[PDB]
């Protein structure tokens, strides 16, 4: 039980950038 | 008890946040906002 | 060129409507959480307990709990219920006025509320006092060595027409 | 209707509040990390709500604590939800607060005009942690009970007042009913009043001095 | 696998609805 | 057991979407 | 052997501390692992894997003196209502994975406490359990939620028999204080190799000990050694290991409504962002902010 | 684009504020409808939803009844108490432990009085502080992980 | 010392508070009866204090309630004092509040600018009375138990929601553990938060509008 | 003698207040040291001392363990619930009772909206109100005493 | 009689409802009073008075038929540790007040439950009890505080004997429905005056009742009366009454410290008022308020 | 239970207070304070 | 039993004195 | 138990005037 | 003519001093109220209870509670205490490091703390582990059929010099 | 009787201290 820890770590770190990028995307497609 | 999912979320979020804080601090060092400092 | 008041209020209705949805969804389980869990409502009710919340045994009751018996037993809904050669009905002891336990008097053949002085039959019909309706009735059938109690569906054998607690 | 609003406006003075509210502005340097304190508050509000809810079924007694928790999980409608939310939100509150502290510190926002806001915040952190310690052992399971039993010993070390402090915190010479009682009072009475007072200060200062400047 | 697909799909669908709703509401001159 | 996976997926989706929505709504960061 | 656990410790293989009774005789510690799913739907067959790894090319001391391979065994403590899946509810893939495994319950009705006796340690480094989750819908003391799973895994021979006497798979000390005289290696008619000892020195005592050969010797001849001097070597190459895990007996309806609520949240969030955008346009036009 | 109001640098009351470190609610994007009404709900609902999601997918465990005569194997507090717990189980001197414990909040209370030596906010403009912070952070995470492992392999994390 | 006060003054802005406080005046028509509201507050503060104190020993459980009260009277140092004060001050609070109402009414002070202050006050009175009802039965003696058992029936009369309201207030179809639990939550958690919010309003309005005029 | 500040009737902000019913904290004796610091403690300590005195001289009774099978003779709530209790045990119609009960706070909530027909404060200047109040007061005290006595002798107090 | 209470109801004269068992046989109700002090110090003799008033010139029906005076009797239930004072601790004034009273306890060790059997109702309209308060200082389950006192007082003859048969001091109804035939007044050899009855009418039943003379008659002759028609009068001129009181077993030290604290409060109040006066002088001089 | 001391204090204080209120109201009717009404 | 009387007396004294002190300190009523 | 009630009533009514008078007294002796 | 600053501060000290007295008097009982009532400290301690908080009987203990007995018993201060032909001393089982109950191993003739691995004697002296001092000792004398326990006043028979818990 | 005397006396004594303290403190020119 430490492959699951690092799984949660990686994801909660990485999903932010996906959210960020996806936020950035929506801003471009609106004409900021 | 050591909860792997929780601990992961803790370690994960502590790192991204510390990272984004330094990133944000930098952004304003290389290009100061009005009244910057 | 720029959204007018009509179109802003329409965005308000659309937007805060959806937010209200989230709120109501969150509020649904909460409202329900406060409503007490069901009293294991599978049958019509189950077993009668004594003064300690154990269980009455019909073998030990008829052996030693009053000659010309009328003894208080925890019945349906926790309610203290009188059991009167075991009788096929229980008499709920909560006097219909405000809810005092009604002690039995064998001498006068009546239950008398000591709170404001209302009286009942050997069955439980009101004869006087401020108490409006008559004492509630249940089914009292023996299964195993214990007394099982269920709620009185059919009409009152003392009023004639359908019960007030039915 | 007959103008209900003007009635309230005339004595509540809504307009001044509205004017005051819409007179505030959020500067460019304020990013997403400036949400962390507010998120900490959200977590606590979730604690307040679900915690209150649980006091309608939880019983702070060695005979009844454990099985009331069982009762909440198995029998109470959405009991399991209420409790799991309280469990997770307890953890999130402490996490977000740490993240908040990071943002405060790496943003220099604790300086000259604002050190009482930082001092109150540190107190808030000790309070929050105390909520955690106390709540943790309320189920009176093996985990929570043995977590109290170790910490309750710690204060003994202190030279003159140590045993007294320990006895006060545990309600006698050892963990037992008195300990659960005190912990329950702590978790559901003392700590919610204390946190409300220090949050009230924390926020009043913030509102008084506004956010700190750009970095 | 199903995880990855479902994730991308859920976000695609909702980015869909975000965009769709942007232009859709612009079209009716609400935005 | 597909529902069990979609369950965890939805957590990861709100998390991501919550960030997206903040970034979008308040123009960055 | 797992069946000796249930012989000596009939009630449960778990002591109130969470220590598994197995460790009372399997005195060395090697790592044990478990794979369970994080969640399972009710009335569903799923796989629990118990891993008992050891160096396959290292060998152990057998009962006599030999150098033989080792066996794996495990106890799996599942939550209430959980139990080994009926054979006709196990798919094929899973059947092939399980091998020749004789799941027994620890006792009558203790169906969630699952013993798995000796298996050749070279095909069963990992043991696959087919388990059937219970169902709250038609059993009133099974409820959805998160419950512990305890796991006890062993490889290699033990150290104590049910009777209480040591095995040939451990250390041997010295009896009393003093110089050892003769390390003779006599034998009976039945069992093979044995080894004697003697002590003495100063006014009093002439006592002796016999060691069941199998371990090794590391003693020279004649030393003024006290009470409990290691005169053996440790032959043990196995060990016992414990773990805990958690499983969520989950309800699909809970998760369905969650997905629904999550979707409502995301919609509401779009709505609010779009509403802000409308206000941003109004503010640009009518400068009054 | 966005909505923006620039600092009115002609208003002596704002100037006096800025001078004192605080005029920063006076300019930017409007705090009201924009932030408080439109995005705060987003953050509220979002954090609420993450919590609820975790609560459904990974509900609370109830343990086993407490037993005063049987100590568990593994006996931790909650994660945020790991670093403090680590300190507390590895120093032989009990008093010393209590003090190091007490020193976390008391030390933190002193931070603004120690770093008032300058008016810098940016961490890149204060490398001594950023270093000390990073050092403590890393030591904390170190002691935190340390608590989950056996004592004998903790002050090294079992890696050297 | 180095001027500690000027430190606090500079960020707390004490001087403005001091100026604000010493800018208020009490007019001639304000007599001793204008103390009654403040005395009501004193009584409640005494309730808050002694009530808190009692949560460190009281146990809201049918097995333990009665005898914990016994424990407080007989064994706890000054237990008897704490409890008797709480008992008497409960009664004094309700008395003084009535006296307060008399003064408000026979002084016309509830009029035009001030009717929300009166409305909040009526709510305060219902809240206070609720404290009383709930606390009264916490000892789980014959008196308190039979006081719940009568009132718990009352809401049944209401046509559609009556049984639900009754079930909510008593935690099921009849008085028992659930009733004590809810009452304990009411008395020590809900009612202290509710009274604090409405007192907070009540006082804020008073402070906003000042006392009413001379009669 | 005393200390006194007269209403500055030249200040338009005070005037605007007085006009609205509220400028009365602006004149009189100083609220601070005089009242708040010097006499408030007097009232606080005095009321505290009366309560403590009563608590010592007449301590709380503990009853007898509750018994679900035996109703006491005499079964009252606390004194301030006597009038409401009286109403509640003497009306045959239960619903009617609940309503009369509910009507105490709801009725009182309406008082300022009913008596806003004038701006009089003095009771001698409002004889209709003073009468109605006295009437209710007396009816309350009547119903209060009524609750301590047997039902049959209550609606007359056992005097006629 | 108070001793019949303890015969039929041995455990306690008080039922769980607070009803005193006396009322099970003394069926009419007259007023009873008590005088106890509000507080008493420990180890102190004090006076409890129980008042059982009745109209002294009205007379009752005796066992036979006569018209005799009535007797008083009472049970006094005191708190734990309380008990009748030893004779050598009762002062003289009090001795003269008590009269010829035989305090008995209700049972062994039930010393705080005090029975007082028949006393001539003309010297004992009020009964004086000398009671000794207990002492927390040297008895560990006696504690300072406020406790109930229950009192049960009766005057006049009862209505039911321990055996369950009625006395001659009540009413007498009719047995069945129908016209009464003869009210004959026969007698046995032992007891004196008796009175017969008969009924009947319509197909079935010829039953009869006998009334022990002493009450009175109010019946004519021959009436179609149903089951339970009052054919007597009620002779009873007595009755039983209950009260409750409270007593504070007080501690002098508590009260001492109270007086001390009260004094401190009053001093502090003077101080504050005088301090205000100083400020009033300062404000008059330096106009700055 | 009917507590005579408490009830006395209740009845006592309700009366004195009602009395002093009317007294005080009168005092200002027969001699109005500045701004009286 | 004199102390029992002085006890009640002190209640009546603070009550009276409390009024006196208010009346004195704030010049009447 | 109603002689004690009226005792408490009379006293709590009457002690006020004693307090009032005594307050008035102190005011005269100070020179108001 | 008018009191100066010196005389005002002197009135302040006199006046608010007395007020502070009242406060302290009121605070005295409160502080004390929170300090838990004394654990009936008449003797040196009293009777030992089993796992249910009843009472141990020496007749039923020696009959059936381990051969070569070492059984956990609720002792002084609630503490789980080992009782070892009944031995005249009890061994407190709370390992001196952080307070885990120390299980007994008959095989190694030692108590071993499972928390961080500290060990003790057949008497209770530390041999290793992080635990500083040795396990506490009490008096264990039989009176009636029950075990009475009192605190160890005199010097340690295993250290020599006066106890740490004495 | 003792009640009445003690009451009058307690109040007399404290009116004493009130007055005494008034003039006493006036004398030392504190008031
Ligand atoms: C559920 C818990 C237990 C498990 C999983 C377990 C496992 C095993 C396994 C897999 C073996 C065979 C290893 C091999 O021969 O290579 C074995 C042998 C042995 N076990 Fe256990 N066991 C348990 C309980 C016990 C107990 C309670 C005792 C002592 C009473 C014990 C004593 C022994 C001994 C002495 C041997 C060696 C037998 C021989 O070769 O002579 N085991 N055990
Ligand atoms: C001499 C006795 C008292 C009198 C004559 C009195 C009179 C008053 C007056 C005139 C006000 C309104 C203040 C204004 O006009 O701004 C007020 C409010 C208030 N009083 Fe009293 N009072 C007395 C005692 C007390 C006491 C002992 C307390 C205890 C803490 C207290 C607490 C309050 C509170 C919380 C308010 C709310 C309004 C505000 O803060 O301005 N009062 N009182
Ligand atoms: C402690 C409670 C009781 C008290 C204080 C009490 C009091 C008295 C007194 C004072 C008398 C004599 C009156 C007179 O002759 O003028 C009396 C007679 C009588 N009592 Fe009681 N009694 C008690 C219990 C009982 C009980 C339990 C019974 C029924 C079993 C009972 C039945 C009677 C009867 C039938 C008489 C009339 C005797 C006769 O003259 O034939 N009493 N009682």
Describe this structure in words.
The structure holds 16 protein chains of eight kinds. Chain B has one domain (1-31). Helices cover 73% and strands 0% of the residues of chain B. Chain B is built from one helix and no strands. Chain B has one helix spanning 4-30. Chain C has 166 residues and is an alpha+beta fold. Chain C has two domains: 1-39, Single helix bin (Single alpha-helices involved in coiled-coils or other helix-helix interfaces, Up-down Bundle); 40-166, Rieske Iron-sulfur Protein. Helix content of chain C is 22%, strand content 19%. In chain C, the strands form two sheets. Chain C has a five-stranded antiparallel sheet, with no helix packed on it. Chain C is elongated and about 95 Å long. Chain F is mainly α and 29 residues long. Chain F has one domain (1-29). The longest helix of chain F is centred in the middle third of the chain and has 24 residues, at 2-25. Chain G is of the alpha+beta class and 289 residues long. Chain G folds into three domains: 1-171 and 234-254, Cytochrome f large domain (Immunoglobulin-like, Sandwich), CATH 2.60.40.830; 172-233, RNA polymerase II/Efflux pump adaptor protein, barrel-sandwich hybrid domain (OB fold (Dihydrolipoamide Acetyltransferase, E2P)), CATH 2.40.50.100; 255-289, Single alpha-helices involved in coiled-coils or other helix-helix interfaces (Up-down Bundle), CATH 1.20.5. Chain G is built from three helices and 16 strands. Chain G has helices spanning 2-8, 92-98, 252-285, and strands at residues 33-35, 39-40, 45-51, 60-61, 67-68, 71-77, 83-84, 103-105, 113-120, 126-132, 145-155, 178-179, 194-195, 211-212, 224-225, 239-249. In chain G, the strands form five sheets. A six-stranded mixed sheet of chain G has the order 2-16-11-6-9-8, with no helix packed on it. Chain G has a four-stranded antiparallel sheet with strand order 1-3-10-7, covered by helices on one side. Chain G has a two-stranded antiparallel sheet with strand order 4-5. The longest helix of chain G is centred in the C-terminal third of the chain and has 34 residues, at 252-285. At the J-L interface, helix 6 of J face helix 1 of L. Strand 1 (25-26) of chain D pairs antiparallel with strand 1 of chain H. Bound molecules: protoporphyrin IX containing FE (HEM) (3 copies). One protoporphyrin IX containing FE (HEM) sits between chains I (24, 26, 30, 34-35, 38, 41-42, 203, 206-207, 210-211) and J (25, 39-40, 43-44). Chains C, O: Its main location: membrane.
């Amino acid at each position: 039980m430490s492959g699951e820890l690092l799984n949660a770590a990686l994801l909660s770190f990485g999903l932010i950038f996906v959210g960020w990028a996806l936020g950035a995307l929506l801003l471009k497609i609106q004409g900021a | 008890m050591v909860e792997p999912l929780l601990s992961g979320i803790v370690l994960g979020l502590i790192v991204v946040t510390l990272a984004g804080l330094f990133y944000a601090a930098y952004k304003q060092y290389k290009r100061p906002n009005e009244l910057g400092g | 060129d720029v959204p007018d008041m009509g179109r802003r209020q329409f965005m308000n209705l659309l937007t805060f409507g959806t937010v209200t949805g989230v709120a109501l969804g969150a509020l649904y389980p909460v409202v329900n959480y406060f409503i007490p869990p069901a009293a294991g409502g599978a049958g019509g009710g189950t077993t009668a307990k004594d003064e300690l919340g154990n269980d009455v045994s019909v073998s030990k009751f008829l052996e030693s709990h009053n000659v010309g018996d009328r003894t208080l037993v925890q019945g349906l809904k926790g309610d203290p219920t009188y059991i009167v050669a075991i009788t096929d009905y229980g008499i709920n002891a909560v006097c219909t006025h405000l809810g005092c336990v009604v002690p039995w008097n064998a001498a006068e053949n009546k239950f008398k509320c000591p709170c404001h002085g209302s009286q009942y039959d050997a069955t439980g019909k009101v004869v006087r006092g401020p108490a409006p309706k008559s004492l509630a009735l249940s089914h009292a059938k023996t299964e195993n060595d214990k007394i099982v109690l269920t709620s009185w569906t059919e009409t009152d054998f003392r009023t004639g027409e359908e019960p007030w607690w039915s | 209707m007959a103008n209900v609003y003007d009635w309230f406006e005339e004595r509540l003075e809504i307009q001044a509040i509205a004017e005051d509210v819409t007179s505030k502005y959020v500067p460019p340097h304020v990013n997403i990390f400036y949400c962390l304190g507010g998120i900490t508050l959200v977590c606590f509000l979730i604690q307040f709500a679900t915690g209150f809810a649980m006091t309608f079924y939880y019983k702070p007694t060695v005979a009844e604590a454990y099985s009331s928790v069982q009762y909440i999980m198995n029998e109470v409608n959405f009991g399991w939800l209420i409790r799991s939310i309280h469990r997770w939100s307890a953890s999130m509150m402490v996490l977000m607060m740490i993240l908040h502290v990071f943002r405060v510190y790496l943003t220099g926002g604790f300086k000259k005009p604002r050190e009482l806001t930082w001092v109150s915040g540190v107190i808030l952190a000790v309070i929050t942690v105390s909520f955690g310690v106390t709540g943790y052992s309320l189920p009176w399971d093996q985990v929570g009970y043995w977590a109290v039993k170790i910490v309750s010993g710690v204060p003994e070390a202190i030279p003159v007042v140590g045993v007294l402090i320990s006895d006060l915190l545990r309600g006698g010479s050892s963990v037992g009913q008195a300990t659960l009682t005190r912990y329950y009072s702590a978790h559901t009475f003392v700590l919610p009043w204390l946190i409300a007072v220090f949050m009230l200060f924390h926020f009043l200062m913030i509102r008084k001095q506004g956010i700190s400047g750009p970095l | 696998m199903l995880a990855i697909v479902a994730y991308i799909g859920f976000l695609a669908l909702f980015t869909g609805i975000a965009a769709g709703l942007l232009f859709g509401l612009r079209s009716a001159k609400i935005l | 057991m597909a529902i069990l996976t979609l369950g965890w997926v939805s957590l990861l989706v709100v998390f991501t979407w919550s960030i997206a929505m903040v970034v979008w709504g308040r123009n960055g960061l | 052997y797992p069946f000796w656990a249930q012989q000596t410790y009939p009630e449960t293989p778990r002591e109130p501390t969470g220590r598994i009774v197995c460790a009372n005789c399997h005195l060395a510690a090697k790592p044990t692992e478990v794979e369970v799913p994080q969640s399972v739907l009710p009335d569903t067959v799923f796989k629990a894997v118990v891993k008992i790894p050891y160096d396959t090319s290292v060998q152990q001391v057998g009962a006599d003196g030999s150098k033989v391979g080792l066996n794996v065994g495990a106890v799996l403590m599942l939550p209430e209502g959980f139990k080994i899946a009926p054979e006709d509810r196990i798919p094929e893939e899973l059947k092939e994975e399980i091998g020749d495994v004789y799941f027994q319950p620890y006792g009558e009705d203790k169906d969630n406490i699952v013993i798995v006796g000796p298996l050749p340690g070279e095909q069963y480094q990992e043991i696959v359990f087919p388990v059937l989750s219970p169902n709250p819908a038609n059993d009133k003391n099974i409820h959805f939620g998160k419950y512990s799973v305890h796991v006890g895994g062993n490889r290699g021979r033990g150290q104590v028999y049910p009777t209480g006497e040591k095995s040939n798979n451990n250390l041997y000390s010295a009896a009393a204080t003093g110089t050892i005289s003769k390390i003779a290696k006599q034998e009976g008619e039945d069992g093979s190799v044995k080894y004697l000892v003697d002590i003495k020195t100063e006014s009093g005592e002439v006592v002796s000990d016999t060691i069941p050969a199998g371990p090794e010797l590391i003693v020279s001849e004649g030393q003024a050694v006290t009470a409990g001097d290691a005169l053996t070597n440790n032959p043990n190459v196995g060990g016992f290991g414990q773990l805990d895990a958690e499983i969520v007996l989950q309800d699909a309806n809970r998760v369905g409504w969650l997905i629904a609520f999550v979707a409502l949240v995301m919609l509401a969030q779009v709505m609010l962002v779009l509403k802000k955008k409308q206000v941003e346009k109004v503010q640009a036009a009518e400068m009054n902010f | 684009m966005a909505t923006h109001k620039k600092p009115d640098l002609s208003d002596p009351t704002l100037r006096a504020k800025l001078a004192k470190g605080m005029g920063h609610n006076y300019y930017g994007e409007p705090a009201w409808p924009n932030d408080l009404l439109y995005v705060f709900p987003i953050v509220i609902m979002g954090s609420f939803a993450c919590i609820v999601a975790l609560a459904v997918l990974d509900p609370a465990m109830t343990g086993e009844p407490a037993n005063p005569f049987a100590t568990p194997l593994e006996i931790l507090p909650e994660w945020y108490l790991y670093p403090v717990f680590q300190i507390l189980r590895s120093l032989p001197n009990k008093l010393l432990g209590v003090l190091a414990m007490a020193s976390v909040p008391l030390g933190l209370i002193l931070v603004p009085f120690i770093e008032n030596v300058n008016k810098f906010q940016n961490p890149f403009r204060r490398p001594v502080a950023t270093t000390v912070f990073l050092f403590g952070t890393l030591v904390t995470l170190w002691l935190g992980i340390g608590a989950a492992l056996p004592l004998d392999k903790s002050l090294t994390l079992g890696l050297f």
